[PDB]
Amino acid sequence: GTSQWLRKTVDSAAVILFSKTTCPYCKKVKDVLAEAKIKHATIELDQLSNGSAIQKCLASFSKIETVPQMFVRGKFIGDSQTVLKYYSNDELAGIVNESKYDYDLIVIGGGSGGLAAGKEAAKYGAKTAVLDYVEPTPIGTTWGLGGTCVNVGCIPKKLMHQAGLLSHALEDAEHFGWSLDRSKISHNWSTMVEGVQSHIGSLNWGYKVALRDNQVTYLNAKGRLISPHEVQITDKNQKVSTITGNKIILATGERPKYPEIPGAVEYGITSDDLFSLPYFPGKTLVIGASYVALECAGFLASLGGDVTVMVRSILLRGFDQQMAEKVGDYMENHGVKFAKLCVPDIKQLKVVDTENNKPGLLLVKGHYTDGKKFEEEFETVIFAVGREPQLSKVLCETVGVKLDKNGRVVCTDDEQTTVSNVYAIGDINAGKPQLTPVAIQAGRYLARRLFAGATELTDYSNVATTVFTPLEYGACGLSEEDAIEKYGDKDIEVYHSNFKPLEWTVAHEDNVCYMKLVCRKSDNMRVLGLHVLGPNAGEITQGYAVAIKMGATKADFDRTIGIHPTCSETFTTLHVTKKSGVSPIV
Template identity: 60%
Template structure:
């Protein structure tokens, strides 16, 4: 009966009475008995506190009631967290964003915007473009451009320009949050209760905030090797893009897309680059395409040291850069490798930033092996009022646009009565290796596993971009492949492209795959000539036929 009269209940509870009750509650039942002089008010207070603790009160009064400081607290100021917070604020909710960058072992830190903006997609693409411009200058002479001055690259000029642009983005995000009335706090967030967090700023000051709902968007950070000298002498992608000096002769440890992208553009700047590979390139991607991308890297000067893992990093000489000695062992024999480099860049994967934010105190279940958070199809964790988006999700894409989409749609479901969920199927992506690799849908290995080789038809072709013909480079090194399901009208379930402007090419075909495009529809599409993308409208040779896929002329 009491809970049916919430308006009366809210009217009689004062802050003073709440404080008296809570104090009494913690002192124990005997003390409570001593304080019961006005039984009706005290009993109401007791029931109120119990209901608050159990979460029933919030359900009755509405999650956005004055029982909490905020309707929503987002932990993490990356692309997904910012998108979710701004969308929620636009829907009239009281929102806070907490973001704090723990410095790398080298002391590197950055501003608001997360990995993509500061130490990921944005600086990576800009430095990749720097390398492409170097190749373009080499090509230019063949097209009639004449210049006699020696061409050199200035690392400091590039680094300053890239970081100035990133700084403008950091400022823009802060202004955007302010304009949307989102309270941004530069502090490290940690749960102390299911609805309460502690925020610690860089000076060590602690503040406490409560919210009806939380969104975890903490992202990932690079993984280290766990060997002597790794954190003392090596860098990661978190350090590379703001490195105050040219890295010189560089060893890249790892074969992830981060490893290959960084190794690729460093080599494109004219540096001596070696990539140490433990097993395979681009795990999780189509291996046919990954190996072709690696072959192109070797053609353009990147050296690969395969089937080795580092065991020790030693400093021979300090400096900017200094000199390092790397000791590695073979994964197949007793062979030992030793080499000297100016810089060692570790890119062996990333770990979810979930281990030190008090998720155990909130009751959120986490995969103990990788720190990833299991969620349902609405990004809801094991705790109903706590959600998660972005790279920390178990079994989902680690891509910026995915986090942004998930964040926006989540806010609309939580606060606008929407029902649309993030679609994690047929997500297009691109690896910005020197020869770019774009894909959407299944890798060939996964398609065979799911559908069986006999139920697939794989069309493929080499090609030679027209812009490569006059310089005479990379003849028939570019490659296109589509994987079609014969049981479903040859619907395209895998799209793969190795060539220039891969992101621009793949984006449109990603939309086509969302619409369920078939091989017949591709054949009936008139290509744009002369382009690289038109190859997908003229493919005739199947892998099963073992026919010639080299191209000559238009």
């Protein structure tokens, strides 16, 4: 147990010191390493439950049982007198840099998970390389370091959402006494895009500065794993070479899918192109019904656009379907048009006008599920029909890394693949929620286990979400239909209520915002799922995710007192059950 932990920690740590906080010989070794700029992990034996057992087990490696003991890449280097001797003789720098491999860690992919993993590993003395390359979109769009969220995901989409929310703030301001006239104000797309891209540029630069300051090697190159320890890299000049590493983290993410229909790749775009587009999309069709499709259609409508969404079957498949339909009803009431039960079968009428900075024109042909025909003209067609990895480009078949039927990596609960030195994090890890804070937690926690002897695993259960549609939807835990399937209808109680934000009163809807708690009767009314549709839904939901993590019950919500006036306080006084049939309106 302890001995198996100690052997795993010594084998994989790059530079590690076993120590006690009160030992002045240990302080002397710490000061020499700091002076020589040698980064390392430290384990303070006097602060661990079984320090005495670990101290004994160390002798199986070093033949001594005292502290300090310093190791480099699995090899005992010395005690205090010995480390000082190497320092005085100018031999220490060469010893701590001796390695069978070029790097202790190679990260393939410089996004949310990979950057987090690489920076954390470098803190413990691991010699680290992060590779990042952005293959251009079909029309040629590309961007800088930081991954999908930073460049073409959470960051620009929430800034554009905020631009949309400000339209209603302008409307509300007249009712609260301000002299403006909303009807005479218009929106400039390119001014917004320039501000969004200036912020993204500051993030690209900030990540390169962070890697430099952590002594991480950044290679803007495409990587391919060709054997367990060998990574083939390809240059911006197409120069090909091979680097070796002890541990490998795969962190390459996903890219958007296109449907296999004529004209889709040639004449449509995806979210990858939208957030830097130099002209306003104009009259727009969004094909798809994911959170990406609905978030983009939502802000485009608030910015003044003529927007239609083509839905094959349902909205937000995999989310609670009562809440999904309330999300869509709000958008349809506030200007978004929906072509329901419909799929596309794209023709070009005008080429994009780079001269005068204007979109082209397209004819879209499709059909409804009953066979009736769809035919209509649009200036822009955005496909949001899912995302996928392309691990065939990243991973030679002969390495032995197992994939599932969707092409994602099959991992143990510590992110290990079927190849013992190779790990995977983020969107390519099969069966995990595909979210930026999950990829960051996974990468930081894994680096600590590899290079600092940590044991803590990432917990992937009950991870909260928020969909940033024009009225936002936050959730944590099970949908109501999933709870009933798992436990049976008679064991599920649902408390629910409508509400009206106080900010909406003077601004003139009464009963559109909504929240519910899905509970298990036979387990002390445990809260299985929380759902809220309303303003600031992500800020509302986050704190409750801690309480659900700790096993909150309905009684825990009841005994906590509300903060007034807020939207969130409605969760503390819920009482109407769905079984009662009583109306949830206010």
